[PDB]
Design a protein around this nucleic acid. Sequence first.
RNA 1: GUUUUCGGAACUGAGGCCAUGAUUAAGAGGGACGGCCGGGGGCAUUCGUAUUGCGCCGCUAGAGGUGAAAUUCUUGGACCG
Length: 136
Amino acid sequence: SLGPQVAEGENVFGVCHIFASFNDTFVHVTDLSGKETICRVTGGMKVKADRDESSPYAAMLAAQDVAQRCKELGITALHIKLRATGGNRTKTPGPGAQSALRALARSGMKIGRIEDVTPIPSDSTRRKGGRRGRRL
RNA sequence: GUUUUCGGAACUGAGGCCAUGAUUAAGAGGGACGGCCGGGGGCAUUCGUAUUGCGCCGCUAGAGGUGAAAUUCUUGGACCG
C-alpha cells in the first residue's frame, strides 16, 4: 500500500475495461498489460433488483466504488477501453457506459486515451434464433 | 455377183468460235484476327477476425436470460481481463 512514486510531478497509469451490454455492465480495472487486475465490480454489486442491473445508476455506483478503491490503493490515471457484447449479437454499447465514464471522470480520476475495443466478426457463425427471428 | 450413190444410231482425237462459263458479301447467320472486360466455371493454394473447448495466471460473488422470472453455471473459483 506504500510505494516510492512521485505524486505532484507525474502520474500512474492503468487501463479500465468498461464492458456494457443490455443485460449487465462490467467496470473492470487492470494494470497497463491487462494481465493483473486491480478491482472488479459489476452492476449486480450495487442493486439487488434483477429488473435494472444494467441501469445507469448501478453503473454509476459501481464506478464510484471502483474509483474509491483505486484512490485508496494509489492509481491516478486511467486509459478507457470500451466494449459492447460483440460477436454476432450486437455492436452498440449498453446503457451503463455513458454513466460509468461520467462517474469515473467526476471522481477526480484523470483520463488518458479512450478507445472502443469490441470483438468485430468477419462473418462468423449463425446468430441464435430462427430464420424468421424472435417474434414477440 | 464382189462393193458402191441406193444410208437408220452409241463411243473416242485435233483445232477454232462463246462478251468462253461463278450477281452480292443483307444494320441475315457461322467462323478467323486484335485490345480488353466480368462476385461466369472447375482444380490447387493462402489469409482474416469471430464461435466453441482446453492449458496457465490474477482478484472477486455472482454470471446468464427476460416485459417480469425460473430452469442453467457457480468459493471444487462461475463471469471478466
